[PDB]
Amino acid sequence: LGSRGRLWLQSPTGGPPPIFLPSDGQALVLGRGPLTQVTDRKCSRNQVELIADPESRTVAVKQLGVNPSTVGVHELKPGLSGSLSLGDVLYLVNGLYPLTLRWEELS
Amino acid sequence: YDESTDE
Structure with missing residues (x-):
């Protein structure tokens, strides 16, 4: 459903603009x-590194922070990676601050 | 935003 487009992360209602x-x-x-507007000290300033793949509509997520991020149902550790498909949630730290992966078409 | 990370 739509060959060309951009991948972005949706924040909770009344949150930061589209990432x-x-x-x-x-x-x-x-x-x-x-960018995330998270001020929680348990969240690292460098919590996760994201690499987008528009063709497959997925995003690779590597954890860099000390405290656990959660990619879908998979809790990560520093140096480990998970994958986001459309609709999947990234919890930045400790099961908090969810970001949902979405897809914007060009046409 | 500029604080050290907790544990």
Whole structure:
């Protein structure tokens, strides 16, 4: 359903604006900062690194932070990675601060 | 945003 488009992360209602991911393969680090608006000290400023794949509509997520991120139903550890498909949630830290993967068409 | 991370 739609060959060309951009992948982005949706925050809870009344949260930060859409976080669109580089469609060229470049990495995007997320964590405590103005992009996610998370101020929780348990969340790292470099919590996860994301690499988007628009063709498969998936996102690879590597944990860099000390405290556990959760990608779907898989809780990560530092150095480990999980995968997000459309509709899957990324919990930035300790089962909190969910970000849902969505797809915006160009047409 | 600029604090050290907890544990």
